[PDB]
Structures are given as structure tokens and as C-alpha cells.
Design a protein around this nucleic acid. Structure first.
Lengths: 156, 196
DNA sequence: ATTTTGTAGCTACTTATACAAAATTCAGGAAAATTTTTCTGTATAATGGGAGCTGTCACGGATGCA
DNA sequence: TGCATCCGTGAAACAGAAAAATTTTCCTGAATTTTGTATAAGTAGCTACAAAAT
């Protein structure tokens, strides 16, 4: 690509000769063989990174990167969530405690998304005709106002 | 022109975006919710046409008190409450328009009325079966059938059924003479005639 | 004096079961297709770079010394 | 040997290649519904019926 880029530079400079500042791009693509999409990509592609700490500027007071955060998240989100957990928990955990297990088994509320009804049916007590019934039952139960109207605000 | 898929809801109770809508296409049946469970759909629509009277029941403070449904892949338009509020506040015709559409959902009820809660789970199932063929039916050779890809027990919501949809209908499918199936199809043979 | 209460009853009559293959879809595999990344050569001849900076200190050292 | 200086502190190449990758295809396979389908009773109904309270 380095060469392609350079080659473009020269070829585009030729365009610039006729069309000053080669404003042509897609027209340059008639000679660039590809939408400016890659031309601009090339542009960014050919960028050299920055010290993360070049002293900032308009003031030598500080380096760069000292105005951002890591891949982490603010407690504000953390908590809200964790509320969700329990909020739920109880709110679920007030209708058919056994079934509530499968609610967490065939779903989350722990660390499976899942335990495929298949495996789950037998997991709790070996079953085939007692699963998606209580499944929907559980949902529609904790669904509808007064029930689902508790996560209605905490839709997290 | 809002819409969804064959397995979705339009909304719940408690949810305050209650203005008259405009099912642009597809049934988008609405499944009125209940406490413990069991949701009629009742509502079921056509081109262009409205549903979900909300800012209209207990004023604009009405709670849907009825969960909704994106029945088939939806197609539904809506309009700023003003259309049924300010724009409606104007000439009757404006309101009348919405009222005419409301009268459609109303007519719908009357249609369910009698046909539904008739008595038998077979006659009743047919009492609105032909009706259905008159709603989303598909006429073809045999006659005015529906064809929509369906349960045995959504059907049960038609009665309070368990295997009647897959058992009794089989009768009409063959033993009794009234429809036929292509994996999940309906071929109403007829308006009346055999099986009447 | 019918009517509601009955009792002694069924039949119809309808869930319920459980299975069940049939669907019916889904996922993964497998390519295979291909796009992108690598690799290699290049023959007149070619044989030391860039810079500058030039205003405290201290100390301990300063070995180095004469 | 105290007395120099004198470390260094706190403040742009390419064409030719290939081979990778990758990646779209497939397919498939299975796994997984649904539905059909039985299934089996029991049944809760239901429908008359009967004597005895309007």
C-alpha cells in the first residue's frame, strides 16, 4: 500500500496540475481505480500516531491522553445495573421459587444465558411438557402492569 | 409506517405513547393483556387503518391497560396526538375520520361478538373461520380460504383449546369437508355449501 | 305448580400425555474463491553525518597534581 | 593533598511473484419445533330429569 499511496500522490499531483489541489477524487478514481472511500482510508491509514504525552499545547503543563479513560466504566452505570439484578431478583423471586430456578437456568440471572430447555427440562426434574408452558407463564406473569411495570422504569 | 415482525408486540399497558395509530398493512393484531395471563388479541387490521385508542380513553392520562402485539410482520403508521387532538379538535369530519376507523375496530368487536363465546368450540371455531376467510382470506380454487402460517393453539385462543385446532380442524380438513392444509395453510373450501 | 332444587345420572365431551415425526430452522464447515499480504530482484557507477550548544550546581571528587 | 573540573541535581519500489490468508458457499446436519398425533382416561361439563316452594 505504501507504494500505491505514493503512486496515488504522484498520479493525483498530475490531476492537481490540470485540476489544481486535485479536488477530483472519484474523478481521480477514474485514474485511482477506486472510490475516494479507500483514498480517504489511505489518508488515515498513512497516519503516524502521537506520543501519548506530548505536552499538551497552548501550555506545557501536561502531556496528552491525560484527559481520557480506559476500557473501564463509571460506577454510575455499574450500580444501576446491579440494581437491576436484584430488583429483578426479588421481583421475580416472588412467583413459583422452583420455576424461578429455570427462569435463571434456561436464561441468565447467573452465568448461563441458557440451559437449553432440552438440557434444562431434565436438569430440574426431567421434563418435556412442563417447560415452555411455565416459561411463557413466568414471563406473562412478571409481564403486564404491576409486574413488568417494575422494570418499566429500570429497563436496564 | 411503523412495523415489526410475525412474533412481537406493539406495546404494553402503562406505556403513555397512546395516540391513535394507522396500521398501514398486515394485521398487527393487538393482544389485550391480563393480570395472571391469557391475552385476547382482539384487534386485527387492514391497510392504512388505525388502532390503539389511548389519549382518548381516560383523556391523555389513560393507561393502555392492554398490552399490544406486532402480530404479523407489522405495518402501522401513526400521527402526532394533535391529529386526533388539535387537528381532531377542528371540523367533525377530522374526528369522524378517526371515529370511522374506531368504528372499524368496533365493527371488529361486533364480528367477534356472537361468533366468539358462542357455545361449542367447533361451531364457534367456524363461526368466525369463514369470517377470517373474509378478512385475510385467500380465495383460490376451492374457495375463499385464508392462507396464513399458523398454530394449533393460537387457535386455542380461539376456543381455550388444547388439540382441537390440530384434531377437530383435521375433520374439516378431510373427514368433514371445509378446508385443506399445505404444511400450515388453510383452504376454506367454501362460504357455506358442504359443512355450511 | 313451576321451579328450583336433585340425584343419580349417563352421555358427549374435552382436556391431558406423551410421543413424534416430522418440520424447520441453524451453524459450522468447508470450501473455495479471492483478495491481500509477502518475497525477490534490480547490473554503467556510486565508498564517513549533523549539530552548535555555548549563562546554576555540587559535590564529591578530584583524580591528579604540581 | 586541597584543589583543578567537573557530572548533572534539585529546583522512499516493484514486479514479479507467490502464498497465504479469508471468506463467501455449502451444507449440512443436526439439532431443534410443532404438530400431529396420538393417547387415556377421566370429566366436568352437559344435558333432562323430579318433586316440592316460587
Amino acid at each position: 500500500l505504501y507504494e500505491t499511496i505514493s503512486r496515488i500522490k504522484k498520479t493525483t499531483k498530475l490531476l492537481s496540475q490540470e485540476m489544481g489541489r486535485k479536488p477530483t477524487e472519484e474523478e481521480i478514481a477514474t485514474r485511482m481505480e477506486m472510490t475516494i472511500e479507500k483514498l480517504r482510508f489511505i489518508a488515515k491509514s498513512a497516519q503516524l500516531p502521537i506520543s501519548l504525552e506530548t505536552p499538551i499545547g497552548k501550555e506545557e503543563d501536561s502531556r496528552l491522553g491525560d484527559f481520557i479513560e480506559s476500557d473501564g466504566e463509571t460506577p454510575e452505570d455499574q450500580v444501576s445495573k446491579n440494581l437491576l439484578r436484584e430488583d429483578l431478583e426479588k421481583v421475580l423471586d416472588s412467583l413459583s421459587p422452583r420455576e424461578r430456578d429455570v427462569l435463571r437456568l434456561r436464561y441468565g440471572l447467573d452465568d448461563g444465558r441458557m440451559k437449553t430447555l432440552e438440557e434444562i427440562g431434565q436438569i430440574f426434574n426431567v421434563t418435556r411438557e412442563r417447560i415452555r408452558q411455565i416459561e411463557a407463564k413466568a414471563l406473562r406473569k412478571l409481564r403486564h402492569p404491576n409486574r413488568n411495570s417494575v422494570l418499566k422504569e429500570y429497563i436496564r | 409506517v411503523e412495523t415489526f415482525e410475525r412474533n412481537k408486540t406493539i406495546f404494553f399497558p402503562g406505556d403513555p405513547a397512546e395516540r391513535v395509530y394507522f396500521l398501514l398493512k398486515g394485521a398487527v393484531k393487538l393482544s389485550r393483556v391480563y393480570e395472571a395471563g391469557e391475552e385476547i388479541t382482539v384487534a386485527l387490521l387492514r391497510e392504512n387503518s388505525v388502532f390503539g385508542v389511548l389519549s382518548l380513553l381516560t383523556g391523555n392520562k389513560s393507561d393502555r391497560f392492554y398490552h399490544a402485539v406486532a402480530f404479523t410482520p407489522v405495518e402501522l403508521l401513526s400521527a402526532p396526538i394533535e391529529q386526533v387532538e388539535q387537528a381532531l379538535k377542528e371540523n367533525p369530519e377530522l374526528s369522524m375520520l378517526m371515529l370511522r376507523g374506531l368504528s372499524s375496530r368496533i365493527l371488529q368487536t361486533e364480528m367477534m361478538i356472537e361468533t366468539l363465546a358462542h357455545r361449542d368450540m367447533g361451531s364457534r371455531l367456524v363461526s368466525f373461520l369463514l369470517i377470517l376467510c373474509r378478512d385475510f382470506g385467500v380465495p383460490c380454487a376451492d374457495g375463499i380460504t385464508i392462507d396464513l402460517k399458523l398454530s394449533h393453539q393460537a387457535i386455542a385462543e380461539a376456543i381455550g383449546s388444547t388439540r382441537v385446532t390440530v384434531t377437530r380442524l383435521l375433520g374439516d380438513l378431510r373427514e368433514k369437508k371445509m378446508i385443506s392444509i399445505h404444511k400450515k395453510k388453510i383452504t376454506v373450501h367454501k362460504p357455506v355449501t358442504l359443512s355450511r
